[PDB]
Design a binder for this molecule. Structure first.
Ligand SMILES: N#Cc1cnc2ccc(-c3c(-c4ccc(F)c(Cl)c4)ncn3CCO)nn12
Length: 306
């Protein structure tokens, strides 16, 4: 026995509630792991997540490290488990609510998010290839922060995978999946062409722009920073409906406000420009995750980030 298995894991602490199923911190062979538990009737959701996390060549420093899918029978019922790396800081949402970040800190968070999304989006054709994957629910609550101050993308359960050879998506995609607040304009107004996989990648980029705005607000320079807020906190109620979002994003054409103080700092001017170029209503005009990664890599190099 060398591989990680559920019978050898001891749950220690409740740490979150997933889309479906509960999240715990557990100990496996002296190490801390995260465990997400589903009931037997949630087998479809558990299986789909296990399937995405088992995708060939998925592993990357900025994608949640998956360990195993398993079952655990306690003698009364069977639990369906997913086991992954554990990150003490939790989500980027938790981290930004708790702390302010330095310019260096902000670039680290943004660059790592873009690098993880670029890998998710990347198709590798051939032998041990990799299908392009679109997230469909990117947001700050779905990104974790590591001890080294970098991010890893998580909550891949709603992802869609593309097969290049047949130009097909692995599932029959349902309309308007995802957190309403982060839905792209084309998803909100249902103009999205769900037969073109590039449509999904473009919608992820819009959501990434919103996450970058959340990070930038928390960047503290000379003690100057904004308070933590979710995108559109100023325009929509908590738990907004598709109709509430559509009226703001599609009809009124509003985006999160880019404050004047972001023009005084080079790192913030770069971040603000990226946000604007993620927020275009026309998905085809948006930057790619790879282009953003390149821009932010050049910036981190200029700042001398360790
Ligand atoms: N809080 C916290 C914390 C600290 N480290 C981790 C790692 C993961 C998760 C997690 C999972 C999950 C857990 C086990 C798994 F095998 C898989 Cl495939 C997913 N599903 C939702 N979350 C909430 C964060 O988005 N939470 N988390």
């Amino acid at each position: 026995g060398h591989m990680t298995i559920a019978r050898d894991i001891v749950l220690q602490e409740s740490i979150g509630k997933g889309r479906f199923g509960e999240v715990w911190r557990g100990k496996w062979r002296g190490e801390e792991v995260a465990v997400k538990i589903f009931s037997s009737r949630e087998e479809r959701s558990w299986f789909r997540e296990a399937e995405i996390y088992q995708t060939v060549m998925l592993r990357h420093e900025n994608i949640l490290g998956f360990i195993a899918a398993d079952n655990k029978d306690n003698g009364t019922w069977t639990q369906l488990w997913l086991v992954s790396d554990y990150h003490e800081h939790g989500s980027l949402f938790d981290y930004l609510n708790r702390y302010t970040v330095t310019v260096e800190g902000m670039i680290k968070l943004a660059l790592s998010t873009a690098s993880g999304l670029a890998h998710l989006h990347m198709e590798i054709v051939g032998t041990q290839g990799k299908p392009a994957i679109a997230h469909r629910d990117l947001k700050s609550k779905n990104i974790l922060v590591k001890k080294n101050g970098t991010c890893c993308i998580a909550d891949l359960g709603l992802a869609v995978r593309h097969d290049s050879a047949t130009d097909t998506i692995d599932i029959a995609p349902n309309h308007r999946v995802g957190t309403k607040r982060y839905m792209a304009p084309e998803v909100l107004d249902d103009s999205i062409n769900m037969k073109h996989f590039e449509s999904f990648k473009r919608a992820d980029i819009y959501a990434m722009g919103l996450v970058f705005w959340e990070i930038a607000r928390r960047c503290s320079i000379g003690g100057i920073h904004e308070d933590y807020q979710l995108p559109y906190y100023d325009l929509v109620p908590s738990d907004p409906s598709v109709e509430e979002m559509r009226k703001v994003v599609c009809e009124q054409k509003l985006r999160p406000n880019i404050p004047n103080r972001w023009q005084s700092c080079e790192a913030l001017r770069v971040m603000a420009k990226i946000m604007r170029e993620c927020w275009y209503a026309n998905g085809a005009a948006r930057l790619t995750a790879l282009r953003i990664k390149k821009t932010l890599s050049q910036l981190s190099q200029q700042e001398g980030i360790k």
